[PDB]
Every structure is written in structure tokens, then in C-alpha cells.
Amino acid sequence: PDIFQQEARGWLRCGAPPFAGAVAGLTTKHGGESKGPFASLNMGLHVGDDRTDVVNNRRRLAEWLAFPLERWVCCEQVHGADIQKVTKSDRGNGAQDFATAVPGVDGLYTDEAGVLLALCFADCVPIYFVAPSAGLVGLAHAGWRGTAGGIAGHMVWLWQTREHIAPSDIYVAIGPAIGPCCYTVDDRVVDSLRPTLPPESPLPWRETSPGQYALDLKEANRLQLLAAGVPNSHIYVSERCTSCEEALFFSHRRDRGTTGRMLAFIGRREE
Numbered sequence: 001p002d003i004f005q006q007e008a009r010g011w012l013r014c015g016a017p018p019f020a021g022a023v024a025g026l027t028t029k030h031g032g033e034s035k036g037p038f039a040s041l042n043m044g045l046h047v048g049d050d051r052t053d054v055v056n057n058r059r060r061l062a063e064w065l066a067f068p069l070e071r072w073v074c075c076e077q078v079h080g081a082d083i084q085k086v087t088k089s090d091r092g093n094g095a096q097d098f099a100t101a102v103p104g105v106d107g108l109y110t111d112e113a114g115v116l117l118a119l120c121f122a123d124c125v126p127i128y129f130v131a132p133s134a135g136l137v138g139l140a141h142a143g144w145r146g147t148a149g150g151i152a153g154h155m156v157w158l159w160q161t162r163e164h165i166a167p168s169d170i171y172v173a174i175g176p177a178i179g180p181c182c183y184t185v186d187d188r189v190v191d192s193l194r195p196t197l198p199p200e201s202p203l204p205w206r207e208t209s210p211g212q213y214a215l216d217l218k219e220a221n222r223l224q225l226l227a228a229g230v231p232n233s234h235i236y237v238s239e240r241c242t243s244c245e246e247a248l249f250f251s252h253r254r255d256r257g258t259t260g261r262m263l264a265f266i267g268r269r270e271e
């Protein structure tokens with residue numbers, strides 16, 4: 001059964017055992033207020049949707065999770081590989097106004113409870129991190145550019161060097177994202193990814209016609225995490241494809257570039 005399991009409303013809970021101490025999941029497209037190409041639980045404030053609808057969609061998730069919107073932290077998501085540590089002093093950044101999101105980064109982490117990391121997705125890989133013993137959670141957004149930039153291994157490096165967490169204490173869930181079934185790229189993309197994998201490494205793409213590659217970004221990120229020291233048995237990978245599962249997900253590719261965003265989220269409750 002998939003590690004992301006449908007809840008009673010428009011979200012999937014991350015059911016990997018190491019995440020049992022966290023509020024962790026990914027929304028589906030249903031149960032919201034948005035219309036047209038954004039129908040209906042569009043969580044993205046920077047896709048041209050009605051802001052009132054989007055904020056109400058976020059308030060709806062906050063109700064489902066019992067995790068108030070005032071406690072979320074969002075980031076700009078510039079398709080780079082930069083990551084920011086956040087704390088309760090960052091709560092609300094980007095939660096209702098995109099202009100206040102943490103700028104210039106594509107991943108966040110925190111070692112505090114009461115802080116919901118919240119990133120938007122519609123094909124790119126959501127990478128959830130937890131070190132349960134140490135109370136760390138993290139979340140990163142990895143499309144091809146962020147993967148080429150090594151964002152997944154950068155999170156691990158920051159936890160090791162700044163938070164003094166061995167990679168062996170880290171657990172990862174790679175969430176729903178576009179699969180190689182639906183994601184075809186060119187030599188430019190694969191060439192940018194080759195340097196990030198070990199020399200002996202199996203390549204997470206297949207050339208389906210000359211110069212065209214079916215690319216598995218989930219596996220690319222898994223291979224990077226393994227190389228950074230995260231144990232194989234600590235890495236859980238969803239098989240769900242955002243493009244394929246049209247009844248659950250917005251997809252930038254399938255929806256031809258005008259669509260909503262799901263929210264990936266992780267945080268720990270404050271008692």
C-alpha cells in the first residue's frame with residue numbers, strides 16, 4: 001500500500017512509520033473554493049488564482065489538520081537548491097501573502113514544534129525529512145533544477161554540519177510527483193543531473209527516442225540521498241504519479257501549465 005494514504009477529506013497522510021510523530025501529508029485537489037483550472041483546493045498564491053479563494057483553501061486545510069494557518073511557514077520556491085532553518089519567529093511568513101514567504105529558498109527545516117512547513121507542488125518532487133529522536137522535520141521542493149542543484153543532499157549536509165545529526169538518524173519520504181511514465185526531457189536536463197550521481201550509479205532515466213529521456217526524479221533524489229548517507233531502509237518512495245492520477249492531483253504538465261497547487265506539509269504539534 002502506498003506510503004501516502006487517503007484521509008477523510010482532501011489530503012493524503014504520510015504513513016511511513018518514522019513520520020508517525022509528525023503531522024505530514026500532501027493535499028489532493030478536492031474540497032476547496034477555487035474555480036476553473038484551479039478547481040478546487042488550490043493552495044498556491046502565485047498561480048493567478050483568486051487570493052480569497054486560496055486563503056480560504058489554506059484555512060480549510062488548517063481546520064482539517066487542527067494546525068492554524070498563523071503557524072505555517074512558506075518559501076518562495078525559486079527552483080534552486082537553497083534551504084532555510086526556520087523557527088516560531090517565522091510563523092506566518094508566506095501563509096496568507098506570498099510576498100512574505102521566506103525568499104530565495106526551496107526547502108525549509110525546523111527543530112521546533114508548533115511550526116508547519118508548507119510548500120506547493122504540482123509535479124515536482126516533495127521530499128519530507130524527519131529525525132525523530134532530535135525533533136527535526138524538513139521539507140524540500142525538487143524539480144529538475146533543484147535536483148541538479150543537489151537540494152536533497154544539501155538538507156542532509158545542513159543537518160549533519162549545523163545540527164550535528166548523523167545521516168543514519170534521518171528518514172525520508174519522497175511524495176507524489178510526476179513519473180517517468182509522463183515526464184520526458186532532453187539532453188540538457190539529463191546532462192545537468194549526471195554530475196550529481198555517483199560515477200557507478202544506475203541512471204534514473206531511459207532514452208525513449210533519440211535525445212528524449214523518460215526521467216524519474218523520485219529515483220534521482222533517492223540516489224542522491226543514498227549518496228549523502230541516508231540509509232536505504234530509511235527512504236520511503238510513493239508510487240503515485242501526479243500526472244497519471246488526474247482525479248487526485250493538479251499537474252503542471254498534464255494541465256498544460258495553468259493549474260492549482262497541492263500543499264505538502266510537515267510539522268510537530270505543541271502540547
Ligand SMILES: O=c1[nH]cnc2c1ncn2[C@@H]1O[C@H](CO)[C@@H](O)[C@H]1O
Nearest residue numbers: 044045046047076077120121122124
Ligand atoms: O503559494 C505559492 N508558494 C510557493 N510556490 C508557488 C505558489 N504558488 C505558485 N507557486 C509556484 O509553484 C512552483 C512550486 O512547485 C514554483 O514554481 C512556484 O513559483
Ligand SMILES: [Zn+2]
Nearest residue numbers: 124141142143
Ligand atoms: Zn516545482
Ligand SMILES: [Zn+2]
Nearest residue numbers: 181182241244
Ligand atoms: Zn504518470
